[PDB]
Amino acid sequence: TSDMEEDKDLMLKLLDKNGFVLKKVEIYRSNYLAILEKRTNGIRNFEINNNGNMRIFGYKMMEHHIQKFTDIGMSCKIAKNGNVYLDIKRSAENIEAVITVASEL
DNA sequence: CCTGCATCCGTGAAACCATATGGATTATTAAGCAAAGCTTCTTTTC
């Protein structure tokens, strides 16, 4: 969707803004991937699904980071190896909120 | 030397340095996978 395009525009705007460099930005399963450079704060990528949900996924994230993203109301799915899903709705205010909580981790 | 007594031994009721090193542990990614979801063909209903 073009809303996913514009939310990609503000996403790269606020990740490029806040000094969080990217490994690669990928359209994969027709979904966006704002992948972090290193596994910083136990986080892998800042992805966008086309199903109205931008998602933050990681590997062995600390609990207090997860609490900081449930401050802005995000779902989580831990795995058996430390893989953690973080669901939020894809919107510009959620772009600003997720990248401003990620910008203070 | 060999007969004759004694006994006695068995026997059961500290700290460190240094240097590899590899094996153990952790992260990271490709594969795959079950589950879901289009696309058309029959099947059942009025």
Swiss-Prot record:
It comes from the Viruses. Disulfide bonds: none annotated. MotA synthesis starts immediately after infection and stops abruptly some 4-5 minutes later. Required for the transcriptional activation of middle promoters. Middle promoters are characterized by the presence of the conserved sequence [AT]3TGCTTNA (MotA box). MotA binds directly to MotA boxes. This is Middle transcription regulatory protein motA. The lineage of its organism: Viruses, Duplodnaviria, Heunggongvirae, Uroviricota, Caudoviricetes. The chain holds residues 107 to 211 of 211 of the full protein.
